[PDB]
Amino acid sequence: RLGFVAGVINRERIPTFERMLWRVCRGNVFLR
Amino acid sequence: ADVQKQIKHMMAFIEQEANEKAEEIDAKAEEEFNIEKGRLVQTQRLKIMEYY
Amino acid sequence: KQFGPLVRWLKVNFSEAFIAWIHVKALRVFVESVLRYGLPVNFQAMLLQPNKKTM
Amino acid sequence: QGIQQLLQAEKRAAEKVADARKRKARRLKQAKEEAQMEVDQYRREREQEFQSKQ
Amino acid sequence: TEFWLISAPGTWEKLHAATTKNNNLAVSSKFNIPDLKVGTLDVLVGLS
């Protein structure tokens, strides 16, 4: 039904961004 | 490989929400059925009672 | 006089309190096992048993 | 390659919640005109008790 | 006395008996749990 938000982040923090997002959301999310 | 697991868990979730939210409407389609029929029978019977 | 009524009040309530403490664990292990793991219908359930100084 | 797969299953769910609209409302237009059987029924029950008083 | 509580989904319910093969660590009993009603995602995470 819904499910969109997009934004900007620096390249030097992307590896720890996707790992922290994987941890507190507990799966069920899609990041490209 | 791992991201294909994260997709298919959500594909199960979005169809589960579609199956559930239709079912509460399906429960609403039966609960509002028996009370609107019971009401409109009464308003029919109240009119004919005055005509009685 | 009140010592007998006290210990029988603790024994019936804390037993009900501890059973409720296990039941919130069974609810808490039911959630997050459908998040970290898949949900075709239900997650494959199992639990464990304690350990000392090999943990 | 998965985002086109992502929304089209969700777009299938848009017809599934629409199926809840084309079933409940179809029940409601049926139920409102099934209450016209109440009209034809009690007029017979009227003429049952309005002929013994006529 | 401590206690440990781990669930391992992925037969796979014979693979927890392969964790009972680790007899030096724990005894590893079952604690079977009946199924509960599913039908939510949003307030399910808010529940946790």
From Swiss-Prot, chain B:
Which Gene Ontology BP terms does the record give? pH reduction; proton transmembrane transport
Q: Which gene encodes it?
A: ATP6V1E1
Q: What is any one of the record's Gene Ontology cellular component terms? A: vacuolar proton-transporting V-type ATPase, V1 domain
Function field:
Subunit of the V1 complex of vacuolar(H+)-ATPase (V-ATPase), a multisubunit enzyme composed of a peripheral complex (V1) that hydrolyzes ATP and a membrane integral complex (V0) that translocates protons. V-ATPase is responsible for acidifying and maintaining the pH of intracellular compartments and in some cell types, is targeted to the plasma membrane, where it is responsible for acidifying the extracellular environment.
Tissue specificity, please?
Answer: Expressed in brain (at protein level).
Q: Which UniProt keywords apply?
A: Acetylation, Cell membrane, Cytoplasmic vesicle, Hydrogen ion transport, Ion transport, Membrane, Phosphoprotein, Synapse, Transport
Name used for this protein in its record: V-type proton ATPase subunit E 1
Q: Does the keyword Amino-acid biosynthesis apply?
A: no
Task: Name positions with the PTM Phosphotyrosine.
Answer: 51
Predominantly, its location class is: membrane
Give the source species.
Answer: Bos taurus (Bovine)
Q: How does it assemble?
A: V-ATPase is a heteromultimeric enzyme made up of two complexes: the ATP-hydrolytic V1 complex and the proton translocation V0 complex. The V1 complex consists of three catalytic AB heterodimers that form a heterohexamer, three peripheral stalks each consisting of EG heterodimers, one central rotor including subunits D and F, and the regulatory subunits C and H. The proton translocation complex V0 consists of the proton transport subunit a, a ring of proteolipid subunits c9c'', rotary subunit d, subunits e and f, and the accessory subunits ATP6AP1/Ac45 and ATP6AP2/PRR.
Cellular compartment(s):
Apical cell membrane; Cytoplasmic vesicle, Secretory vesicle, Synaptic vesicle membrane; Cytoplasmic vesicle, Clathrin-coated vesicle membrane
Q: Which domain of life is it from?
A: Eukaryota
Which GO terms of the molecular function aspect are on file? proton-transporting ATPase activity, rotational mechanism
The UniProt similarity line reads: Belongs to the V-ATPase E subunit family.
Swiss-Prot record, chain C:
Q: In which tissues is it expressed?
A: Expressed in brain (at protein level).
According to the UniProt entry, the coiled-coil residues are: none
Q: Which cysteine pairs are covalently linked by disulfides here?
A: none
Localization annotation: Cytoplasmic vesicle, Secretory vesicle, Synaptic vesicle membrane; Cytoplasmic vesicle, Clathrin-coated vesicle membrane
Q: Which domain of life is it from?
A: Eukaryota
Q: Which protein family is it in?
A: Belongs to the V-ATPase C subunit family.
What the protein does comes down to:
Subunit of the V1 complex of vacuolar(H+)-ATPase (V-ATPase), a multisubunit enzyme composed of a peripheral complex (V1) that hydrolyzes ATP and a membrane integral complex (V0) that translocates protons. V-ATPase is responsible for acidifying and maintaining the pH of intracellular compartments and in some cell types, is targeted to the plasma membrane, where it is responsible for acidifying the extracellular environment. Subunit C is necessary for the assembly of the catalytic sector of the enzyme and is likely to have a specific function in its catalytic activity.
How is this protein organized at the quaternary level? V-ATPase is a heteromultimeric enzyme made up of two complexes: the ATP-hydrolytic V1 complex and the proton translocation V0 complex. The V1 complex consists of three catalytic AB heterodimers that form a heterohexamer, three peripheral stalks each consisting of EG heterodimers, one central rotor including subunits D and F, and the regulatory subunits C and H. The proton translocation complex V0 consists of the proton transport subunit a, a ring of proteolipid subunits c9c'', rotary subunit d, subunits e and f, and the accessory subunits ATP6AP1/Ac45 and ATP6AP2/PRR.
Q: What is this protein called?
A: V-type proton ATPase subunit C 1
The organism's taxonomic lineage, starting at the top: Eukaryota, Metazoa, Chordata, Craniata, Vertebrata
Identify the segment of the full-length protein shown.
274 to 328 of 382
Curated annotation (Swiss-Prot), chain D:
Coiled coil start-end:
3-52
User: What top-level branch of life does the organism fall under?
Assistant: Eukaryota
The protein's location, in the record's own words, is:
Melanosome; Cytoplasmic vesicle, Clathrin-coated vesicle membrane
Q: Where is the composition biased (Basic and acidic residues)?
A: 30-50
Tissue occurrence:
Expressed in brain (at protein level).
Describe, as the record does, how this protein assembles with itself and its partners. Answer: V-ATPase is a heteromultimeric enzyme made up of two complexes: the ATP-hydrolytic V1 complex and the proton translocation V0 complex. The V1 complex consists of three catalytic AB heterodimers that form a heterohexamer, three peripheral stalks each consisting of EG heterodimers, one central rotor including subunits D and F, and the regulatory subunits C and H. The proton translocation complex V0 consists of the proton transport subunit a, a ring of proteolipid subunits c9c'', rotary subunit d, subunits e and f, and the accessory subunits ATP6AP1/Ac45 and ATP6AP2/PRR.
Function statement: Subunit of the V1 complex of vacuolar(H+)-ATPase (V-ATPase), a multisubunit enzyme composed of a peripheral complex (V1) that hydrolyzes ATP and a membrane integral complex (V0) that translocates protons. V-ATPase is responsible for acidifying and maintaining the pH of intracellular compartments and in some cell types, is targeted to the plasma membrane, where it is responsible for acidifying the extracellular environment.
What is stated as this protein's family in its record?
Belongs to the V-ATPase G subunit family.
Its recorded name reads: V-type proton ATPase subunit G 2
Section covered of the full-length record: 6 to 59 of 118
